[PDB]
């Protein structure tokens, strides 16, 4: 390249969906009910066989506090409009938005077995946990430390990036962080608002009817529900629970088979907990530097240069709406360092001289906003003969009186 510069001309602001699971449901096995459920001889059953229940329940308590730590690391980073729409993404007073309830209604149908049955038999009363574990073979689902109300409140707190600076000035400052001046936003605000609103309309159409983006959240919750239902299936159809109905060998083969099924459940839940921890670490990284700050990385928060992001609280997950800036229609323009006029060399004050073929303009380096060459845009230093790649043009003085 001798004298040529590649400059973008058009731009598209686009939103993208990033769904990351951050929490697994809590399971706890109540001892002295899993073993000797209805044998009514719970001394000799809990002596030889009852010491292996607490070993598994310790691991379930460990993965439960690990998932609570995951939700605390993701959703609790902080403690506490214009031409854009923002009506479907903000809370509308049960303190949830219109993307949040679509996510909740689509993801809560991924479970249809043990968890929904426990929620139905709970009766919205937390004092019946001794009763609800009696009829479901001793398996209990603990509620999380951070409830749905607190997660929704923390999401509403983290949605303070839409703030005492007004929102168009914030978008202008984020464009200035990208590398384009504020005149591009303030002169193309209607097109940007239309693209953002149409992108929210497309995200609502593509999140609800088709699965589309909900293929990495529905399947992991479905895997968790199937792993819990297979425990009840292999606890009821074969190796059944102790009911009212020499024979120590039979009760030994019933109490050893039901323990091994639980050990299978813990062993294949620990790997799922590791995968959820990796996803939660990715979510904490994507909320530390895409939310609560513009990111300098490329193609990490979203496709193109990252501009903004909004968090949303999905059940057992987090939904990031990434707002990004995609350049398009690159053009090759002819560059020149300085311009000679009246025997005086003029250098650009802030920008690059460009030529589109016939006329000469002063533009920014990262965008094609043509400005006519005046004396308020160039400064004078040196003579004509010293600059190597000089070009002939006329600088237009704004003072042209009668």
């Amino acid at each position: 390249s001798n004298n040529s510069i590649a400059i973008p001309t058009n731009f598209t602001i686009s939103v993208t969906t990033e769904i990351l699971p951050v929490s697994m449901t809590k399971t706890s096995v109540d001892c002295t009910m899993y073993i000797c459920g209805d044998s009514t001889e719970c001394s000799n059953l809990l002596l030889q066989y009852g010491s292996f229940c607490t070993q598994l329940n310790r691991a379930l308590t460990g993965i439960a506090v690990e998932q609570d730590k995951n939700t605390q690391e993701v959703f609790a980073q902080v403690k506490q409009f214009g031409g854009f729409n923002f009506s479907q993404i903000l809370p509308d007073p049960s303190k949830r938005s219109f993307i949040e309830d679509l996510l909740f209604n689509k993801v809560t149908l991924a479970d249809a077995g043990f968890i929904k049955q426990y929620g139905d038999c709970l009766g919205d009363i937390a004092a019946r946990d001794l009763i609800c574990a009696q009829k479901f073979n001793g398996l209990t689902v603990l509620p999380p430390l951070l409830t749905d109300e607190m997660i929704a409140q923390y999401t509403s707190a983290l949605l303070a990036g839409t703030i005492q600076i007004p929102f168009p000035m914030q978008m202008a400052y984020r464009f200035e962080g990208i590398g384009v001046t504020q005149n591009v936003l303030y002169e193309n605000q209607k097109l940007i608002a239309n693209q953002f609103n149409s992108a929210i309309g497309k995200i609502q159409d593509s999140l609800s009817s088709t699965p589309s983006a909900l293929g990495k959240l529905q399947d992991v919750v479905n895997q968790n529900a199937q792993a819990l239902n297979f425990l009840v299936k292999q606890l009821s159809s074969n190796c059944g629970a102790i009911s009212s109905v020499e024979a120590e060998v039979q009760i030994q083969r019933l109490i050893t088979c039901r323990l091994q099924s639980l050990q299978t459940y813990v062993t294949q839940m620990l790997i799922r907990a590791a995968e959820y921890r990796a996803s939660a670490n990715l979510a904490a990284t994507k909320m530390s530097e895409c939310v609560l700050g513009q990111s300098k990385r490329v193609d990490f928060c979203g496709k193109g240069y990252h501009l903004m992001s909004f968090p949303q609280s999905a059940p057992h997950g987090v939904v990031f709406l990434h707002v990004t800036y995609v350049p398009a229609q690159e053009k090759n323009f002819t560059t020149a360092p300085a311009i000679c006029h009246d025997g005086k060399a003029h250098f650009p004050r802030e920008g690059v001289f460009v030529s589109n073929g016939t006329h000469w303009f002063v533009t920014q380096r990262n965008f094609y906003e043509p400005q006519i060459i005046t004396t308020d845009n160039t400064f004078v230093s040196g003579n004509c003969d010293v600059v190597i790649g000089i070009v002939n043009n006329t600088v237009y003085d704004p003072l042209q009186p009668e």
Partner: antibody
Amino acid sequence: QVQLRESGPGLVKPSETLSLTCTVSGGSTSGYYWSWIRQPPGKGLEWIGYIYDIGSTNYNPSLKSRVTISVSTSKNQFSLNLTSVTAADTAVYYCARGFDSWGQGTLVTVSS
Amino acid sequence: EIVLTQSPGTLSLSPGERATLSCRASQSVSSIYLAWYQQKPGQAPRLLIFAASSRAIGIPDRFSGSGSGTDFTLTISRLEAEDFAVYYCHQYGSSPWTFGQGTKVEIKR
């Protein structure tokens, strides 16, 4: 209880492919994690990869470029294939369910 | 990869004594993402302690696990002659699962 039995070729030439199958008797490949873990003779254990029934294929990020693990439509088998097998890949391959209930190993020598 | 190193590479202990085996990780792994295995000569590995201290089913009260962070211990109390094995420590927390070089436990008579 579940039973894991491994089978496959005992000797392969270099620059060929392994095809090790693992028969699951007493259980089904429907909702559990399954992994392959190998061992050079007189050395430690090295982990190849684990899969789920519907998806989630995770392999080792030192052997990822030449490995594939796949379930079978018979609902009782899954297979491990390697590519560009050098002489340093001879091992006693082990078939496991997550990290519990391993199976007996199959020794795969690789020499011409 | 998180490299797991076992420092007492080979022991030689009489029956009735204790055996303390140490597994050390380069990075801080959690308490719930480590496991222990024993390997008899010419056999498959057998899970002994998953998580830090949770015993499996079919294992006596001799084998006890402890530790959190970058220092994990396996304790064998009242060792018998049927414990001639190679013992391995395993991480299933990070995506590249890493074992270690084993500890070979001998019996002295």
